[PDB]
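Re: export button greyed out
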Amino acid sequence: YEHATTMPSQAGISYNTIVNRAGYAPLPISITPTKIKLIPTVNLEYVTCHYKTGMDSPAIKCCGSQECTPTYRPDEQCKVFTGVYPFMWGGAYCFCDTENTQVSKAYVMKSDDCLADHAEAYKAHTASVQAFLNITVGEHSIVTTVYVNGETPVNFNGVKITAGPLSTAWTPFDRKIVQYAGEIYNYDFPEYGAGQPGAFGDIQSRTVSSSDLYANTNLVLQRPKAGAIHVPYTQAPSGFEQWKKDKAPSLKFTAPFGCEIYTNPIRAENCAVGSIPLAFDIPDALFTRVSETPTLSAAECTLNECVYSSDFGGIATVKYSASKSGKCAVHVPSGTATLKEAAVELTEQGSATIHFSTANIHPEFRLQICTSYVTCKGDCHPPKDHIVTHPQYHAQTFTAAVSKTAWTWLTSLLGGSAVIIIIGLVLATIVAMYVLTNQK
Amino acid sequence: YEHATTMPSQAGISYNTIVNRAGYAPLPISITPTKIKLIPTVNLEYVTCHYKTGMDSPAIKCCGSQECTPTYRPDEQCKVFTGVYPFMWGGAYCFCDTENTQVSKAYVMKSDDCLADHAEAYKAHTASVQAFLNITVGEHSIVTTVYVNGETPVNFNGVKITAGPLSTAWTPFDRKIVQYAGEIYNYDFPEYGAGQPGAFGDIQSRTVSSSDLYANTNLVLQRPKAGAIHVPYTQAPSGFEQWKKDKAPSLKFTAPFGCEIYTNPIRAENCAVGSIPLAFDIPDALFTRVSETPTLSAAECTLNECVYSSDFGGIATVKYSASKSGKCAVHVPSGTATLKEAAVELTEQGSATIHFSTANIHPEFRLQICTSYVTCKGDCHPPKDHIVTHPQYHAQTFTAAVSKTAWTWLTSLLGGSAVIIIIGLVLATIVAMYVLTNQK
Ligand SMILES: *[C@@H]1O[C@H](CO)[C@@H](O)[C@H](O)[C@H]1NC(C)=O
Ligand SMILES: *[C@@H]1O[C@H](CO)[C@@H](O)[C@H](O)[C@H]1NC(C)=O
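Workaround output, generated via the alternate export path:
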């Protein structure tokens, strides 16, 4: 037997349904999502951190001249200044007043703290969805991680369940993300080998331990101060620190649908978007006979009180005269009310208490018990608190909260609109016939 | 300056271009794709090998009874066969004619050779195109790997180059692929936990070293033969061996467009499909004035010998009277002839030989020397050999091979009919005017 349903993607809220074969005991099914994870496929582009302008000692040649060698280091600048007269603590370092040269080199590498303070630039695509589910089919329970691709099955006690695919392809991440300090930022970082000075990714390394290091920090060399041994340089400040000075709140605080953004692996959790289409395959063995389950006779629903709040604010009592005791499944086929429980203990005679949540002013829901269907009615009152801290436990309709008196006005005004028109047409036809009869 | 072009995705065949500025020396471009890789993203969800049906030693009890231990191993089956009379090498085992019990249980494990002789099932999507290019711009050369996403740039001598994205999204790998013995198969394997007996994936392990194993092989325990201590079982023959028996040739032999399917990483190399858009950003320092390059005047192109073969069958010469010697670029802006080279040495006066490949019988191609432009015209003969081992080095048009006699026949059959129609219309108008004039 193949069953199909559609459970909204909302963690922490149960989803109870019932499988009704033509002549067999109903089968209760409950799916409880404890966590829904969306994990994009991310590949590392590069890693950025503060740079260090490590720079070689200035080689001074007296009374002569020097030439520059490349040495092939990231963003290396080498320059020879002629006419220096360097000084030390001991006195004048050189014995020629002029024609002394000083060659100064300045390169850039990753800082000493790049092994801990670095931001990784990822590219994300083709997100994959997983869900932690507590499933209960016909008293057969399981707690398992299901992949929400519409093909991977979770199987237990002969029952197969295939979840998904998620009705939406929306993902909180763009095509380029930046992960720093265990916090995902949605940033459009420069491509590798295309970084710019003063901005994110001015220095780039393919990996934290990688030997290669692109570096474009606008490094230039200035002439040393007269009578001083040092290598002056003026380059644009670190792009990593500048990015951190203003980077906007992370995806923890800006992701739509209230997603929770986590790292290792980069994932989103409890995104309240879309619905998961569930497909059950229940073997015929689990469908027992009607005589084995209690059979209900002479049952009626009484609505003790209803308050159409977000939580289970409504209650009902069913007067029942059952064939025997035992567990009995309860359900609401309509979408006008959702029960807290999908089962109830049932005695030979008595009354059963059922908690439910609804959004209707005047409920009219055709509740199902063991095999019988009892219509349950009543009135609801507004909840006593304006703002709550939990999501909505039901689903509303466009005509849910109209209430009887608004129906009365809308019908009287629209019906009265039609009645007067009908009277006008009747009078017109009558007088037309009368005039035609007046023709001699 | 930004120069955008396109290049056919055909490995080995050099693609030559000339970029012309307003009044500066033309700049040659030469791109040689040595190798083009298409690398899909693959997720491994299980591996499969030959199974080994393990089984415990039978537990024999004389004048007694035993109970089945709960199953805790892959496909474990346990049965307590009663009324056995085991018979060891040292006579009968039990002194008890009947009410002797034998517990026999069996289960499935991976074979001892699953570390090497296994096939791993991947899911493939979102192929990532890569290329290996020789780029030559203005006597500046670089051999590099270019990611054919339309954003990653390659830098050399101040020149930016961005290739891609590939004009087509075609990939030879299906959604589900299988790697075995270095060969890739487009196999629609069952999902993990859905393996069936006697078919590929009857036993499934998430990874090679994983401690989990899903086994479904119809293992069934049979009653032991009288007087024998052994565990008789029955199960479907291994699905891995059956798949190996009839699995069809791998993608290496069936992939369209002549792709070469390689492994580690799973990739398709040298597919003759699609085109790669190229975008060059050339710094303005590379362009030099026409005065520096050797300008040319008073030249004409004579076609020595043309054969429209796949290779460079056409040979022509240009009689040049250059202002000075040096390098000079040559290119055909049209597609009716592709030159062998994009550079030639010019003396003060002389003749320079050019090799070109054409697909048309009468090449009226508008050759472009570095400064002067020469129209080259002639006739061609068909090639001698029906089959060659080279790909086509030129691009053919729909009207390339129409020749002159067919043009005359077409411009006769069409055209003469239009002339006859014009004559008929003229005669009709003339006689209509004549008959209208004769009203009086
Ligand atoms: C399902 O299992 C989870 C984890 O053990 C638990 O938090 C949740 O309350 C369970 N739900 C039901 C209906 O048993
Ligand atoms: C392209 O690179 C390969 C590898 O170095 C080389 O064999 C080949 O000659 C190169 N082609 C050109 C035109 O430079």
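The CA atoms of residues 205 and 213 of chain B lie 5 Å apart. The button fix ships in the next patch.
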